[PDB]
């Protein structure tokens, strides 16, 4: 748009024309142009033959029909529209994650009505415990779980060995006590942005509860926004109300990668995009394509106004302004035509 | 993470006294606003204090447009 607008005036720039003159029409042209856009804009909600998503579906197909996944627009369009159907009403992209999972055909890329984790970390029993929980209850801990690894710094003084004995026992009972709170909650999955003591995993393994630490809070933020449960720092003040529930939890190997699976929450305004793809470059490129698709329909959800593509709009404008230029005599008139003359380029 | 100016502004906006002391939520020195929230504009997280002030307020103006350089110019003239 710009350079072509620049381009056509450039010969007129060779004429010693005061730029203020030129910009004067430019303001005039754009404003006059802009209103005509509004006038010939198209809505559907007055009309009858629209399902609230079909237009969104059409827009993305239109939007998607330029970037690298152009042959699968009919595929992803449903994904994002129904996905964006979840974004209400925070409507922000931060909620919905993108998982740039390597390998696999992008046609096998997944949208989960929940969250999955591209991440984990190896602790001792982390493999041992069950990895299926059909109707589990979800615990979200921000607080770490380890024997005073990084807590308040304090020296202690004790003469008696038994008191020395008692103390180190007591430090453990601290972690057990949280874990007892953890277990007696009756939930089955615990998440932590923070590191978790390996041993508790065994306790969780011993009692067949799942746990995970060092989690991205963002995905945790999704998780709490996904399952509706509340992230906790206080194990003791815990109650089932803040305790997440999900339709089913799992964790699956994908591209060799060790992922954690849970979806089916009927009221989950947040999903995540599992993006299979065998090229590293594809991922971000797709995501950027994916990113645009989301934000654009987001405004479309915001604004029920549509127009046709394929350069028709601009040609309509150029024509309108072209006739309009006939109205306005003089130096402006030449600008108007070139404004149209640059306009048609697309 | 508001800087001293920011709260200094904000304190004035709500007319409420900032408290270096954490505990005492004094009635008289307490905030009062028509509406406060977060909005999204230009893919930028925005904390909004929508206000209706008869006593007179230190208001704020919204700059929308493409070129930050234009904004900086436009605010300078503004």
């Amino acid at each position: 748009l710009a350079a072509e607008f620049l381009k056509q005036v450039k010969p007129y720039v060779e004429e010693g024309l005061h730029p203020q003159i030129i910009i004067r029409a430019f303001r005039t042209a754009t404003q006059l142009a802009v209103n005509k856009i509004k006038e010939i804009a198209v809505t559907v909600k007055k009309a009858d033959k629209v399902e609230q998503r079909k237009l969104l579906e059409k827009c993305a197909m239109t939007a998607l029909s330029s970037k690298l996944i152009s042959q699968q627009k009919a595929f992803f369009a449903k994904m994002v529209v129904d996905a964006v159907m979840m974004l209400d009403d925070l409507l922000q992209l931060k909620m919905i994650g993108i998982k740039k999972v390597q390998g696999g055909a992008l046609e096998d890329s997944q949208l989960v009505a929940g969250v999955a984790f591209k991440k984990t970390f190896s602790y001792a029993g982390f493999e041992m415990q069950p990895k299926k929980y059909h109707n589990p209850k979800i615990a979200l801990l921000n607080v770490e779980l380890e024997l005073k690894a990084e807590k308040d710094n304090a020296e202690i003084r004790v003469h008696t060995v038994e008191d020395y004995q008692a103390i180190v026992d007591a430090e453990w009972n601290i972690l057990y006590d949280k874990l007892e709170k953890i277990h007696h909650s009756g939930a089955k999955v615990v998440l932590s942005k923070l590191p978790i003591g390996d041993v508790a995993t065994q306790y969780f393994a011993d009692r067949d509860m799942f746990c995970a630490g060092r989690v991205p809070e963002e995905d945790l933020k999704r998780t709490m926004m996904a399952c509706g449960g509340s992230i906790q720092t206080s194990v003791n003040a815990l109650s089932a109300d803040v305790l997440g529930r999900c339709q089913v939890f799992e964790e699956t190997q994908i591209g060799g990668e060790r992922y954690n699976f849970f979806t089916g929450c009927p009221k989950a305004k947040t999903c995540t995009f599992i993006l299979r793809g065998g090229a590293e470059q594809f991922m971000e490129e797709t995501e950027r394509s994916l990113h645009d698709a989301i934000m654009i329909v987001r405004r479309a959800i915001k604004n029920d106004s549509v127009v046709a593509g394929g350069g028709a709009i601009e040609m309509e404008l150029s024509k309108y302004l072209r006739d309009y230029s006939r109205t306005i005599p003089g130096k402006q008139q030449l600008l108007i035509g070139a404004y149209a003359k640059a306009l048609e380029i697309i | 993470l508001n800087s001293k100016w920011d709260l200094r502004r904000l304190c004035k906006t709500v007319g409420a006294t900032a408290l270096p002391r954490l505990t005492p939520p004094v009635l008289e020195e307490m905030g009062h606003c028509d509406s406060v929230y977060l909005s999204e504009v230009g893919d930028t997280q925005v904390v909004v204090f929508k206000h209706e002030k008869e006593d007179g307020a230190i208001s704020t103006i919204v700059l929308r447009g493409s070129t930050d350089n234009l904004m900086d110019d436009i605010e300078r003239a503004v």
């Binding site: 748009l1 710009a2 802009v34 856009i37 405004r299 604004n303 | -």
Partner: peptide
């Protein structure tokens, strides 16, 4: 969506209006 081109042309509009409005350049090393 209309807004796309709507914002597009407007942003372009000021761009040149920004662009054309300068007569010289100054450089500092």
């Amino acid at each position: 969506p209309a807004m796309v081109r709507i914002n597009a042309l407007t942003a372009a509009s000021e761009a040149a209006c920004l662009i054309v409005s300068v007569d010289e350049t100054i450089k500092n090393p």
